[PDB]
């Protein structure tokens, strides 16, 4: 999507696999503010916003808090308390034409600088002079949008660059986005320390013939102590017998 109409995608209620950011080494520029990517796949967030658009390389430095310029001011802006990451990589092989690719547009004039996370797509004729522009172009009446010049021979500073801005928002609500959780193989009939969905304990896990209801996740005895559980990955009921102990 063009920078002025920068495309917003939302991510929530899903396990966020960040391996795509790690394995992919083709990212020309990558900068994180507020959160460190290394400690990112084991931390939960309420929501993630992926705001993607296209610019030229010289402007890539402008997408960040405390930046100024055409891209920073009139098309896309970020808050001064931004907490996320910014990624940018070249797309010359895709966003260039022999006759010049002009499908990417950006706002060249605007009466005010955009507010944080503000999307403006109006094509109002910009009034650059005293004479009001009543929807007509001419003297001091210019179209607010201009098209990039993308050709195979264009210089690196003007070659197209796709930018993606991830912003992680953690409100006072339960976090639907968490990183992948690592599990291990299951061993039965042996005194093991088990941990099912945060329910921890020690005992011997044995196959059982108890029929849970579809929505029930754990069993209990009169003591309220865990007596049976259901393996989250495979829907089979496991009885839990406390490990043998006694007197010698």
């Amino acid at each position, epitope marked *: 999507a063009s920078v002025y109409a920068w495309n917003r995608k939302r991510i929530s209620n899903c396990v966020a696999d960040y391996s795509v950011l790690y394995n992919s080494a083709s990212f020309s520029t990558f900068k*994180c503010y*507020g959160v460190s990517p290394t400690k990112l796949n084991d931390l939960c967030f309420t929501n993630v916003y992926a705001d993607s658009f296209v610019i030229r390389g010289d402007e890539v430095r402008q997408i960040a808090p405390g930046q100024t310029g055409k891209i920073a001011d009139y098309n896309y802006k970020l808050p*001064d308390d931004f907490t996320g990451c910014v990624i940018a990589w070249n797309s010359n092989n895709l966003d260039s034409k022999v006759g010049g690719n002009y499908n990417y547009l950006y706002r060249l004039f605007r009466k005010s600088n955009l507010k944080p996370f503000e999307r403006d797509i109006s094509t109002e004729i910009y009034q650059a002079g005293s004479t009001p522009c009543n929807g007509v172009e001419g003297f001091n009446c210019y179209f607010p949008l201009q098209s990039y010049g993308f050709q195979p021979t264009n210089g690196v500073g003007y070659q197209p660059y796709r930018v993606v801005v991830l912003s992680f928002e953690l409100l006072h609500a339960p976090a639907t986005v968490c990183g992948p959780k690592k599990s291990t193989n299951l061993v039965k009939n042996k005194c093991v320390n088990f941990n099912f969905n945060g329910l921890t304990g020690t005992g011997v896990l044995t196959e059982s013939n108890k029929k849970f209801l579809p929505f029930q996740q754990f069993g209990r005895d009169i003591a309220d102590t865990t007596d049976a559980v259901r393996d989250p990955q495979t829907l089979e009921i496991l009885d839990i017998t406390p490990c043998s102990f006694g007197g010698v």
Partner: antibody
Framework: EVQLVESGGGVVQPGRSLRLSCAASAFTFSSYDMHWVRQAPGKGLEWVAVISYDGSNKYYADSVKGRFTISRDNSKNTLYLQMNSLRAEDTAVYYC??????????????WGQGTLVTVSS | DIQMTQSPSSLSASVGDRVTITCRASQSISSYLNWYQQKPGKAPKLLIYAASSLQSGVPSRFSGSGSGTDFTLTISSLQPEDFATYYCQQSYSTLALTFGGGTKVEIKR
């Protein structure tokens, strides 16, 4: 009580390669991201590289991106920094530092005594 | 990028004086400022993190304060073992960590 010992520093000509090794002790080396920080003679400190706890993520400052490499052996509790194609600017004292991980961002908790590296022709 | 200006470049003070050092940032950083201490020749050591947290094992006389762009490190009562160089380093821009110029504190005479 946390100990970090650096080794492998020395004098090397421009365009050569060097390998620095840091040995950590008295803490879980495998559960803390490790940072390489260089200080030039007479100048201030300067962050160089970072590696996550699991040895799957590596990040570097632009001054060294595509030029240095950072790895870790959790079994040996060691941190390796391969500095290939060294320039005169690389002349500095290198330290390995633990993260601490008490915040969402990177801070340095403990530092070693470091090792000197000089690049001259 | 983020430039950290640490002032004064160097100050003269006697033992027991309430020393203060300022650190300013080019842009706004929430609470991501840390203060390290370094003696001549010796390796730097951590004093303050998050700009409002005393590191374990550090004398209580050191205190960090400030938010936004301006931060201050204050020693209520200077001690002979406090004559060193202090660096202020930001962490907001995670992969662009930068350290301050430094403020050497000399013995006043």
């Amino acid at each position: 009580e946390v100990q970090l010992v650096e080794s492998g520093g020395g004098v090397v000509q421009p365009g050569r390669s060097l390998r620095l090794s840091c040995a950590a002790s008295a803490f879980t080396f495998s559960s803390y991201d490790m940072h390489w920080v260089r200080q030039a003679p007479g100048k201030g400190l300067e962050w160089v590289a970072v590696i996550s706890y699991d040895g799957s993520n590596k990040y570097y400052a632009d001054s060294v991106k595509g030029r240095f490499t950072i790895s870790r052996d959790n079994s040996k509790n060691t941190l390796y920094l391969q500095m290939n194609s060294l320039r005169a600017e690389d002349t500095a004292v290198y330290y390995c530092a633990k993260d601490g991980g008490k915040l969402w961002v990177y801070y340095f908790d403990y530092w070693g005594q470091g090792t000197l590296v000089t690049v001259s022709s | 990028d983020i430039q950290m200006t640490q002032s004064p470049s160097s100050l003269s003070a006697s033992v027991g004086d309430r020393v203060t050092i300022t650190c300013r940032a080019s842009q706004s950083i929430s609470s991501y400022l840390n203060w390290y201490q370094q003696k001549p020749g010796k390796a730097p050591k951590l004093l303050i993190y998050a700009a409002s947290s005393l590191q374990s094992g550090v004398p209580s006389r050191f205190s960090g304060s400030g938010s936004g762009t301006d931060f201050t490190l204050t020693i209520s009562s200077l001690q002979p073992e406090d004559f060193a160089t202090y660096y202020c380093q930001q962490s907001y821009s995670t992969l662009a960590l930068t350290f301050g110029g430094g403020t050497k504190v000399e013995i006043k005479r």
